[PDB]
Design a protein around this ligand. Structure first.
Ligand code: PR8
Ligand code: PR8
Lengths: 505, 496
């Protein structure tokens, strides 16, 4: 029976227990770090990735699918990329009883395979921009201490890869990627991450620079939940991607990529969760609304039951047909309300509506959002609940309005406000080594501090911080401008940026 | 430039040529049988699997995702299953530079993985039924004569697996799978296959029996394009799946499964295609309607061009926003009208809308369906094209009429490729000259029938595919081969 307040000290146990109790994943598959996505959990993952796919389509990035297997000669082409990943590669060496003539790696990430094909698809400036993405699984062997969604050896994800005529287009693409992240993470999943330029000594292998969303988790560690990279022209030279420009000069195009995985789901579940279990944003709720008939099955009350059950159906049909909501009806009269409520709250269903004989007589039903619970139940007339208004805007877009929709939207907005407040509370300004360390140890989250360099010699301080408190310098936000005359918290030299330090997953 | 006629003799080449010219897939990925799905092709495959997912969801089959890797120990548990699939296993043997403790197989199909987990998930009758499906790729190493979508080594597919309390529930599940297949194949993709109980000597390895859709391709060979299987209790025993029933008895549940792959897309493209290239059912058309401004860029005619382009945008906006259709505008004036026509013809765009000054002055536009072409173009008032009011619109009507024309023709093709035979000679003669499916009354559905299968393969390289149990045997009907009373009508064909 799941009942555990979700705090810094308890989160790790809370997460493992909720994974099982809500039947999201099954870790008992006998391959370490390869977890079964069970139905209730997979619906959430699929919803997140479908949204990504949909949003990528709107900004001209086309969905494709590559094979899982990458030939060894592809994977070894780019030096810095392969050294970064070679320990992570599963190798296929036989087909049946016979050895393959060329070994095949299961993709740890798809740059080497995709850019080998870009080399063929890109011959002229006419072929650019070339923007694709795929939703698939990748494979990482060396992943240690596996945790569902957060650190696994088979990882469900989406990767976008774009080929650009110029440096400026490449830079502009990064903003397009960030637009999609904000839509997914904040507008839809109601949480926030710290946007950073990753420290240059820990860039994506092969990248010219790497930008990330480091999300504060309830334990106080950060989780890298988006990776958005400018690969420059390095891969284009290695994989011989060349296009003839308008002057018929042969040019190496720029490459960019963006990746999100099951960690996005990890964040949404973890940040919004409470002592009763899950609290799901509407996007990823397999059931937006559970309607529960109450007080049925009484003696010589078969007629009243039919009327109650009849109205429950008319509510369900309106919510499904007119609003597109996912609705369930729990008409199992053997189960007590206590046991039903436990279960639906455990599973994080945003709204329950209770309809019974008495309330039906008064023309009312009870609507209870998941985050605030029974104490702040809403009495809403049944007529109002059935009330749907619609209009068409200038752009011929249908705008539907309804109280249950309003309640879902208000629910989202409360989750968002609470999640953003949590993030904001876990960014702490520090003016010294000691203040950063005490923050990491006592509070967790991100320690923000002015720092003297964004260049490679900053790694010296990354190591001291790691040794002192196991926190690492994650990066800085270039859009945050340092005040003149501010000094570096660590060296005393003039500050050129604010670095962010944290314990990482 | 693509202009290959699509006949029984040219189909194989026609298929290879249009895969490339339409940029559906890319065979130049240098692992044999592992092809890239390019954007235009992937839209199609994705539309088909999303529909399958949606339909399965509507009948209580929930989507899940299992790992790609299956440990060797799991894979070898069911004797006939492993004998059926061992040759086709890619074996993962190293993690980094280090050999793996236990070999991992890339899933050739997921029964052994999934039923190991059913064992853990099933405890009592209240856990049943348990119904799942997944869209993913599987791996079959031994596949030869690879051909995109039809015969590949990495195969994009959907597989559904259900666990049932009774034998009757398992039989009823097969009917649900079949309704979904009919929806996808016929209602949406506008083609037909022959439903058969697969001959018992050629069942799915580990199945009690197999049901299939064998679809007639333009070359006259048949392609197994759906596989729907009753696994009985065999796997449940092997993987220790047990449930406590209402009377607290420990009993084995019944398992069923169903699979569709990239072959569905293959059939749709192949059956509807013509000498101009693809002809796409609306479900898999990345673009339903291409709108083309015509007669623009003339000397001193910039005013009239912006009127034409303005109206072209108004039509696109109405079709996109009000009706939900996928619409593309080709206003690139640097390209010839001939090159545009050829391209959208080749890519199979259901409808072409042409808008020019001349037609704009009469308040009209030209609508050309892809299947019938410019000889049967429609001249439709623009106000009617813009009129939207169940949603009704003349362009939506043209897409529906187009869809119905595709179905009628593909169904007629199927029907013309089923030939009734009353003797061994007629079967051989049908197979050798006409192709398609040879249907004949036959004395048994059981294992002794394989003697005649062997004789037929030796004569003309055709095999007995199976029989449809729904077909009534005419009173007094005799077996075409033995003269004994017929108990079924077998279907024989050359296979892919
Ligand atoms: N073990 C794991 N378990 C779960 N999620 C993970 C794991 N490892 C990484 N992720 C998730 O994959 C995301 C993208 O990977 P990235 O940042 O290294 O960039 C790229 O790879 C580029 C972009 C696509 C093509 N390559 C990571 O940010 C993390 O959220
Ligand atoms: N090499 C290939 N290339 C393209 N498509 C293929 C290929 N091989 C097979 N198919 C396609 O996969 C389908 C399912 O395979 P099935 O019939 O043996 O049944 C099952 O597997 C059960 C049901 C799912 C879980 N197990 C085949 O009908 C064919 O359409």
């Amino acid at each position: 029976t799941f009942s555990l307040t979700k705090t810094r000290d308890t989160f790790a146990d809370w997460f493992d227990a909720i994974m099982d109790a809500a039947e999201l994943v099954d870790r008992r598959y006998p391959v370490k770090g390869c977890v079964v996505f069970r139905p209730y959990g997979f619906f959430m993952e699929n919803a997140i990735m479908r949204l990504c796919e949909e949003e990528y389509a709107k900004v001209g990035i086309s969905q494709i699918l590559f094979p899982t297997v990458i030939p060894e000669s592809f994977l070894k082409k780019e030096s810095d990329h392969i050294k970064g990943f070679e320990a992570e590669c599963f190798w296929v060496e036989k087909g049946g009883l016979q050895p393959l003539e060329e070994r095949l790696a299961l993709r740890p990430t798809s740059e080497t395979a995709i850019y080998s094909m870009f080399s063929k698809w890109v011959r002229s400036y006419k072929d650019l921009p070339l923007k694709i993405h795929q939703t698939c699984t990748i494979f990482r062997h060396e992943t240690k201490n596996t945790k569902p969604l957060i650190r696994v050896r088979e990882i469900h994800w989406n990767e976008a890869h774009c080929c650009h005529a110029t440096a400026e287009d490449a830079v502009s693409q990064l903003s397009d990627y960030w637009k999609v992240i904000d839509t997914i993470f904040s507008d839809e999943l109601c949480f926030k991450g710290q946007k950073l330029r990753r420290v240059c000594w820990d860039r994506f292998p092969g990248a010219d620079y790497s930008e990330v969303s480091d999300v504060v988790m309830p334990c106080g560690r950060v989780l890298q939940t988006a990776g958005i990279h400018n690969l420059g022209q390095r891969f284009s030279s290695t994989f011989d991607i060349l296009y003839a420009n308008k002057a018929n000069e042969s040019v190496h195009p720029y490459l960019t990529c963006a990746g999100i995985s099951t960690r996005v789901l990890a964040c949404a579940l973890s940040i919004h969760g409470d002592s009763g279990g899950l609290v799901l944003p509407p996007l990823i709720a397999p059931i937006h609304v559970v309607i529960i008939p109450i007080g049925c099955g009484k003696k010589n009350n078969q007629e009243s039951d039919q009327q109650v059950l009849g109205k429950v159906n008319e509510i369900a049909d309106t919510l499904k047909s007119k609003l597109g909501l996912r609705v369930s009806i729990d008409d199992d009269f053997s189960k007590s309300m206590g046991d039903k409520l436990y279960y639906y709250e455990l599973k994080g269903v945003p709204l329950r509506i209770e309809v019974g004989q008495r309330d039906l007589a008064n023309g009312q039903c009870i609507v209870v959002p998941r985050d605030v619970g029974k104490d702040q139940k809403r009495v809403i007339p049944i007529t109002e609940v059935m009330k749907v208004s619609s209009h068409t805007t200038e752009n011929h877009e249908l705008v539907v309005k309804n109280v249950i929709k309003d309640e879902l939207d208000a629910y989202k907005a409360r989750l968002k406000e609470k999640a953003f407040a949590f993030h904001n509370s876990m960014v702490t300004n520090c003016k010294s080594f000691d203040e950063i360390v005490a923050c990491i140890e006592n509070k967790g989250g991100l320690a923000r501090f002015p720092f003297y360099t964004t260049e490679a010699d900053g790694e010296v301080w990354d190591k001291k911080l790691k040794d002192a408190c196991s926190a690492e310098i994650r990066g800085h936000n270039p859009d945050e401008n340092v005040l003149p005359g501010e000094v570096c918290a660590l060296s005393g030299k003039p500050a050129v940026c604010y670095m962010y330090c944290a314990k990482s997953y």
